């Protein structure tokens, strides 16, 4: 908590960040839930009924400044693949976290091949159908770190390969030296 410098906080931006999605449509999608009387946002993908999924979500460019190592906190839900009818033969229960450093913001020009994998992100708890239908999802929290960073800025990216994932929070920070 103390002495943390926040470089990115998806949940606090209130649906305004509009991150790049590749492909657009049937891949990652910005969603809103307002059942708490307060809106919450998320990037969701659930293309579990067709195979060969390779869906990418890329944050906006992050200015590195003096940060030398970054810490990444994700909060997310994952639905049990058994929740789906049976042609879910390509369904997965993990997704992948990537990053890329660059000296310039490439804007809409997103190139998978420039990104390095940080880790596979797996849930401690999957959300089964009975809990989904009762609006009692299981929110997972995972943390990773990356360094050393040397360039003007960096991207984070999330690759889905056929899981039913809702990404509710992405918080990136570094510690003051």
């Amino acid at each position: 908590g103390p002495g943390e410098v926040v470089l990115l906080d998806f949940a606090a931006a209130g649906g305004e960040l509009g991150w790049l999605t590749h492909p657009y449509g049937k891949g990652w999608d910005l969603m809103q839930n307002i059942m708490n009387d307060m809106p919450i946002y998320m990037y969701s993908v659930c293309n579990v009924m067709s195979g060969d999924q390779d869906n990418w979500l890329r944050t906006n460019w992050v200015y590195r400044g003096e940060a030398e190592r970054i810490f990444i906190e994700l909060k997310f839900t994952v639905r049990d693949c058994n929740s789906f009818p049976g042609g879910a033969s390509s369904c997965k229960e993990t997704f992948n976290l990537y990053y890329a450093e660059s000296d310039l913001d490439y804007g809409t020009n997103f190139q998978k091949r420039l990104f390095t994998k940080i880790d596979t992100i797996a849930p401690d708890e999957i959300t089964v159908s009975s809990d989904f239908e009762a609006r009692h999802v299981k929110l997972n929290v995972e943390e990773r770190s990356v360094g050393p960073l040397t360039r003007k800025g960096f991207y984070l990216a999330f690759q889905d390969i056929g899981a039913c994932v809702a990404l509710l929070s992405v918080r990136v920070y570094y510690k003051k030296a």
């Binding site: 839930n33 609006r135 994932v165």
Partner: peptide, 14 residues
């Protein structure tokens, strides 16, 4: 179709 999160709808700021 299948939703990753209950009662969620695609959203885009006005």
């Amino acid at each position: 179709x299948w939703l990753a999160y209950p009662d969620s709808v695609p959203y885009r700021p006005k």
